[PDB]
Amino acid sequence: MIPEHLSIYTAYNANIDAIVKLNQETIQNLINAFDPDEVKRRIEEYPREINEPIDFVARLVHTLKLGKPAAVPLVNEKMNEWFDKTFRYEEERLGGQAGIIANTLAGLKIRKVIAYTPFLPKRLAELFKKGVLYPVVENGELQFKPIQEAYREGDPLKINRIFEFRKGLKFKLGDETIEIPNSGRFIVSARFESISRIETREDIKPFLGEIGKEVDGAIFSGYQGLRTKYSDGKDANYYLRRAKEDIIEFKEKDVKIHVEFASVQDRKLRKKIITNILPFVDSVGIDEAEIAQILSVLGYRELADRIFTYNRLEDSILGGMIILDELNFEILQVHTTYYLMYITHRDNPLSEEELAKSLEFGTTLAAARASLGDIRGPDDYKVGLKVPFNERSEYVKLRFEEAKSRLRMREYKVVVIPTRLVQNPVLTVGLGDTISAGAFLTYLEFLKRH
Secondary structure (H helix, E strand, O other): OOOOOOEEEEEOOOEEEEEEEOOHHHHHHHHHOOOHHHHHHHHHHOOOOEOOHHHHHHHHHHHHHHOOOEEEEEOOOOHHHHHHHHOOOOEEEEEOHHHHHHHHHHHOOOOEEEEEOOOOOHHHHOOOOOOEEEEEEEOOEEEEEEHHHOOOOOOOOOEEEEEEEOOOOEEEEOOEEEEOOOOEEEEEEEOOHHHHOOOOOOOOHHHHHHHHOOOOEEEEOOHHHOOOEOOOOOEHHHHHHHHHHHHHHHHHOOOEEEEEOOOOOOHHHHHHHHHHHHHHOOEEEEEHHHHHHHHHHHOOHHHHHHHHHHOOHHHHHHHHHHHHHHHOOOEEEEEOOOEEEEEEEOOOOOOHHHHHHHHHHHHHHHHHHHHHOOOOOHHHHHHHOOOOOOOOHHHHHHHHHHHHHHOOOOOEEEEEEEOOOOOOOOOOOOHHHHHHHHHHHHHHHHHHHO
16 A cells, blocks of 8 residues: 655755744743833834844734734844744744655655755754655765754754744733733744755755666655845846756656645746746646646636635636646646545546545545644554545535536546545644645556556
8 A cells, every 4th residue: 555665855845843832921021121112113113024033022912912823034044043042942843845745755664765955954854754864975975864964064044933822811011911812823934045045955966866866756845935036146047947957867867756836925936936847847736725826827817816716626627727738747736625636638647546546645644644743654644544535525526527517628637536634633734745745656656557
């Protein structure tokens, strides 16, 4: 069942996600450090990014009193040390699509899992599972090390911080008492320059093809971390030309490549990624929100608006077909709350049943991880079998048949299954990534058999 003989490389995004519990002592001690009217002044002026500590407290306490969640970018690297010296973390865990994917695969105990990120400080390296390899240059040659032991002292440190606040708590901002209405999280995302240089670094770059010889597939993600423009005159395009070069090295070695897409708010960057990356890879993983974002920049604004507004199976099948037809990679996987879907060219070697089985492995693996919070060993996949296909399945199936009646299916194989939906899971972060990892893993297994 688990295709344990396959070897997979993942890049490029891995980071620390760190959680802080805002109890009374913690929030009051923080506020106490500042001048109260200095804080008040900063709230009304409303900082939309965090450059200095007063931006942070201001945005936070505004969020705490409203009792409504918020995410705010950290755009100054030097703040890492401030956060770390001011707060204690409940938990530090691995985040970033490549990180999560690497840890899930190493939890399945496949034959080999190599992960790469250009930024590997010790603190990040130690959050990976045992078993994940990292490529390094040693004595002028390629070697792999256990990733926990491959860290570079001084590498840039990407850390996203989730502040949990629970209802009930009161604190004071000078004389003014303040009770928190609801629970929630205040999220501070790493969005400074040093962690936005998303690439294979120059030392390892010359060995990518040698790395390629060691794997059956590579899963690439994290393009969404690129910025428009960089300090040293580099730009998104510069990094995207390097990204294309990496793709070429693996595909020349007969590696199949899967790109897991992501939300890219800047439409121009989103357009550059789609243009530069998608037509050149084999497999692509998107969610329902992403399908519309892509269509929107491809010019299909009406259909994108329909998808966003009504979330119908039919409009997603049409929109997936358009994206495949326009971009001409090999297979598209769409993940949605109630159904997963594959769209392939008519000459894809897999049968409908194998395509279904691959999707089923994906939703099963994700349901497992959503229930347990972590894949420790291959038997854990079986926990996903305990999560039934959702209550909308029969309606999904009926609507799929109606959709096939309305829409053309000449040039395309379209396969739809219902998800093993977990209502309210131990782990929310990265379920889409885990679906794609399982789907792509089994897609490789079936191709290899063919």
